[PDB]
Amino acid sequence: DNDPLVVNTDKGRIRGITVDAPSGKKVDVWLGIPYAQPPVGPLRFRHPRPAEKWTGVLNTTTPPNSCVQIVDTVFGDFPGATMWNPNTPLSEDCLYINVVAPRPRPKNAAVMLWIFGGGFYSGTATLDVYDHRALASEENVIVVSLQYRVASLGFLFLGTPEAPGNAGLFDQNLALRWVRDNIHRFGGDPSRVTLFGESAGAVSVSLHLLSALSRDLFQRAILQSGSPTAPWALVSREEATLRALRLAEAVGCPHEPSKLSDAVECLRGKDPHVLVNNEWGTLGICEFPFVPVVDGAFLDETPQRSLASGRFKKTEILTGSNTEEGYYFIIYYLTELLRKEEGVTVTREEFLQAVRELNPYVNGAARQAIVFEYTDWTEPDNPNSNRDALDKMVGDYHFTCNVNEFAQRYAEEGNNVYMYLYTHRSKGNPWPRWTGVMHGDEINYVFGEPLNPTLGYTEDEKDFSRKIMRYWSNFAKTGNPNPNTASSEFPEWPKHTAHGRHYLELGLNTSFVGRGPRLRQCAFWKKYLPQLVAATS
Amino acid sequence: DNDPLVVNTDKGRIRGITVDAPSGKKVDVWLGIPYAQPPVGPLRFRHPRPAEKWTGVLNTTTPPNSCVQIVDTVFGDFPGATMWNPNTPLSEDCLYINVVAPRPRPKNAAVMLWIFGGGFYSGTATLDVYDHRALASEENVIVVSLQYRVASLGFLFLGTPEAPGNAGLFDQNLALRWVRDNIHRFGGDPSRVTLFGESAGAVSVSLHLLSALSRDLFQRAILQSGSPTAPWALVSREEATLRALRLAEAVGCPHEPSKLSDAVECLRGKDPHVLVNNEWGTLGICEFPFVPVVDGAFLDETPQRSLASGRFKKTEILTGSNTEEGYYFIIYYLTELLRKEEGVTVTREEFLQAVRELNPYVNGAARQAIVFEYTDWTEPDNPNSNRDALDKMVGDYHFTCNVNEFAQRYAEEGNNVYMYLYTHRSKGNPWPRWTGVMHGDEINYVFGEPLNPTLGYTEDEKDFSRKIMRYWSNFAKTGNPNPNTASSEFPEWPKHTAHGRHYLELGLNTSFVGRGPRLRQCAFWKKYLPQLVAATS
Numbered sequence A, B: 001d002n003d004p005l006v007v008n009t010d011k012g013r014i015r016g017i018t019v020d021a022p023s024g025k026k027v028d029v030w031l032g033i034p035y036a037q038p039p040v041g042p043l044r045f046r047h048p049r050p051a052e053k054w055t056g057v058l059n060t061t062t063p064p065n066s067c068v069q070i071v072d073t074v075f076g077d078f079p080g081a082t083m084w085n086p087n088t089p090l091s092e093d094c095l096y097i098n099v100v101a102p103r104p105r106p107k108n109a110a111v112m113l114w115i116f117g118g119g120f121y122s123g124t125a126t127l128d129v130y131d132h133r134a135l136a137s138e139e140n141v142i143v144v145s146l147q148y149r150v151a152s153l154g155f156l157f158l159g160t161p162e163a164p165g166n167a168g169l170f171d172q173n174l175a176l177r178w179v180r181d182n183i184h185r186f187g188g189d190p191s192r193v194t195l196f197g198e199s200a201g202a203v204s205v206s207l208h209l210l211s212a213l214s215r216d217l218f219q220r221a222i223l224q225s226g227s228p229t230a231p232w233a234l235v236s237r238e239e240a241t242l243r244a245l246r247l248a249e250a251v252g253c254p255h256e257p258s259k260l261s262d263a264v265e266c267l268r269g270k271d272p273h274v275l276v277n278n279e280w281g282t283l284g285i286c287e288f289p290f291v292p293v294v295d296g297a298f299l300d301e302t303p304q305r306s307l308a309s310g311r312f313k314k315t316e317i318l319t320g321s322n323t324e325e326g327y328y329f330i331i332y333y334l335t336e337l338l339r340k341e342e343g344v345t346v347t348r349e350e351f352l353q354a355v356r357e358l359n360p361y362v363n364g365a366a367r368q369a370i371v372f373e374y375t376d377w378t379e380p381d382n383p384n385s386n387r388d389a390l391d392k393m394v395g396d397y398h399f400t401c402n403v404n405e406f407a408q409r410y411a412e413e414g415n416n417v418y419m420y421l422y423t424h425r426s427k428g429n430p431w432p433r434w435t436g437v438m439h440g441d442e443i444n445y446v447f448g449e450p451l452n453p454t455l456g457y458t459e460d461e462k463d464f465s466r467k468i469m470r471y472w473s474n475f476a477k478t479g480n481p482n483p484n485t486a487s488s489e490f491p492e493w494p495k496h497t498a499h500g501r502h503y504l505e506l507g508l509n510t511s512f513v514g515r516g517p518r519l520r521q522c523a524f525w526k527k528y529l530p531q532l533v534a535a536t537s
């Protein structure tokens, strides 16, 4: 076989297809490569097995199945909500990898591996917003994405070997070995693999930097709006079992903590869709039913202890937060107030209501410590301020501050860190204006969506997209985002240093550099508030 | 008598003298006019009596005696410390008024009455820094100053009629009636009297706006770095008696609360200087041994209740604070650290030490509420930040915030208010650089000291002085500081409105207008911290 579009992997040979990128540039794609046996029947909830070797030529020409998950309807066929909806058929057999090489195909090049994230309950590598064609063609990089098991199918934990937990993470781990073993045949470098993700993507990518098993399976990491030290990232093993036994109860299975083997076997029987729909009990804002847990194999300790002791891969890190993280989550949660319409506001009374509902676990000697910190004292009753104040307290505690912590611990262990604050809101953003730049807005720009002519992105937005695609790309290459011009000295993007803590503002005409972001509020949630709760309890 | 320099007051006639202002302009002065009988012997601690009518022509040609007080030596003959030292002989007979008319002498003009302040323990109208010659000549206003009894001689309270308290305030009150009765003969208007002062000066001027007795004795008020709602402004009647009986003990007199008439009579005997030296017991920063008290005559309620109920003269108010209030007081107090030298700094440890010593009455669940508010979280251990952070917490609690409160209550009662933040540090400032603009720095500029050729003020500083002299002067005239150009619309200096809370920055090239100043920290000390101390106690 002299055919460039057929490739012989360890488990057999596959046939790809040449496709046009929206830009018009040509790339080679391999879509739906099985990296594991379908985790069905006795294999559900369990760690994945490598794929059974196949005979003949297999067609990897079309986008694979998305894993079984819930879909978002709460806004009907709104373009803003439907972009995160799975665009392929939902199946238990979802374990596949997608490889996209640029044309001409390089002999040995950089590898960028995208781990999607849906709060560990949803998502797929097949989303339109994650399109490898624009990124691979413009930056000349091998772009790879994977499907990992999600929700209770991926993250159910009972301590038993029939449900050991972290199945989704072991999925990713196995997919990383596939890359290590098979990427050079697509023209990549097994040692130059750079992992990058958003939400759980970042939380996943981070957990590979920590994990013993996936330690030497990649080179660098890019983390978007997520860290392993976030509140929603992990659950206690004691709770994870209760969440599992509650799911057993809710679905009509044996829920007794006495006999665990009864519970898992009954669960294996039930339909996958009824299983994922019964995960949602009483949960506050920004907390999810089934997520990573410290299993003993993938992780043998909590990420907090790993970070403290300094047990993580010595690597360059590119990480950052968006300006308005919370808004997205305060829309779905707390849906009464702050609905999907233009010009919404919040009265001082409604604000005071919200901080109780958004922080239900604090003693009230902490509530007004929050309200004093998160109110604008130049004009306290301002309806705009009180609304934006909700986004900040959610955004900072659940997202922004946790990113800062991980970035600092990496910086002070002598690693090069690059911190960003993404401030750009699209002109064509479908969501209301007040939302501003929400959680996951940068994705469209890192993947080169503005370079699509069929979409009406302004000419400046197309430049901006190419700019951050460059930053991202040559970081995966060189360990540094700075372009060759000004790479020699006084960078556009300074290093996030332990004491300096600098970040770059990613916006349309701003090259502004600050320190943080939001160091005061981070000091609030990390230092002041915890010791106050101690002193009042 | 057709002589312009002789004037016939109600109690007899006086003879003045023409003097050159440092600028070279000529003014007429009357210095050391007795407005009351000397409060000596049986009259000590008591309310003043009007002066006994005199026969013939009296010479009021030289600066009168300063009241008995302590002097500052702690810095030896330092020019910065010695400017507040009394420059006339110290006497118990100190009750006099000074009148300065410009030449040519107007038929009927505006009256600006200066009440000095030394924390109610010191000060005199005769200080070089308060010179009427420059102000009167340049702004064409009748400038008047008075001497009021100070320290325990002025503010001793025992509830007894032999020591009823507020003697210093009744001194001022009597001096205001003298002005009402006698100023038209000097070419002033009895109804256009505008009171203005600094430190206790402002606290005094404010207490005239409140008091029933001195209500109709003036028109407007200008208040510099002081309000009646400040912590050090008043003492409880229960404490004032104890402070008096402690002073009785310390001087070797009967200190028993049983027999009060014994105590006062023994006190009347003792030398005035030994009496003023034994006032200082255990007192924290920015608190003074003998100050105004609610006597029942001058004030029948606490200023807090007066402000709340809205019982104060409906008038225009011009008030403001300086950028670094605390520094001056943290130098004399807490003298170990933060000494008088260039380039002093504060370590993070020393900072944490200070907040305990500077706030000795807070439970420690409040101490770190302060440290979190008053630390710079971009670089927390910064030695410059930690030093400046001490000035702010002292400046805000003891001065700046209290000025804001009084200014707001006047604004929301429908009165016109003009708030300033004085940001200008002299080039020739004798104190160390880090001190910046300290408590009482604006005085030199409001009195026209830069217009003195024998002093090396820059040509811009001379313009600045004339500018704020103008603001001050035509406020006393018109009720508005704005010059005729731009007085018609969109003022240089906007009104401090109840909701807007605007202030003007008084500096060299800044016409900048903000809102506050320092609304966050004021909300801290006024709203947040008090309810936190409640929740933790």
Ligand SMILES: *[C@@H]1O[C@H](CO)[C@@H](O)[C@H](O)[C@H]1NC(C)=O
Residues within 6 Å of the ligand: A015, A016, A017, A059, A061
């Ligand atoms: C994939 O192979 C099928 C036959 O199984 C063929 O019908 C189809 O055209 C192929 N599509 C590709 C490789 O583009």
Ligand SMILES: *[C@@H]1O[C@H](CO)[C@@H](O)[C@H](O)[C@H]1NC(C)=O
Residues within 6 Å of the ligand: A509, A510
């Ligand atoms: C940045 O801001 C605007 C962007 O529209 C523009 O004037 C120019 O590119 C820059 N200039 C500024 C802030 O003066």
Ligand SMILES: *[C@@H]1O[C@H](CO)[C@@H](O)[C@H](O)[C@H]1NC(C)=O
Residues within 6 Å of the ligand: B015, B016, B017, B059, B061
């Ligand atoms: C004040 O009067 C005295 C006489 O008592 C006289 O010696 C002195 O020159 C006068 N000074 C004045 C008014 O300038």
Ligand SMILES: *[C@@H]1O[C@H](CO)[C@@H](O)[C@H](O)[C@H]1NC(C)=O
Residues within 6 Å of the ligand: B509, B510
């Ligand atoms: C105010 O600042 C300086 C004062 O020296 C001067 O450039 C000018 O008067 C003003 N201009 C600015 C801030 O650009």
Ligand code: NA
Residues within 6 Å of the ligand: A117, A118, A119, A199, A200
């Ligand atoms: Na998420």
Ligand code: NA
Residues within 6 Å of the ligand: B117, B118, B119, B199, B200
């Ligand atoms: Na004072």
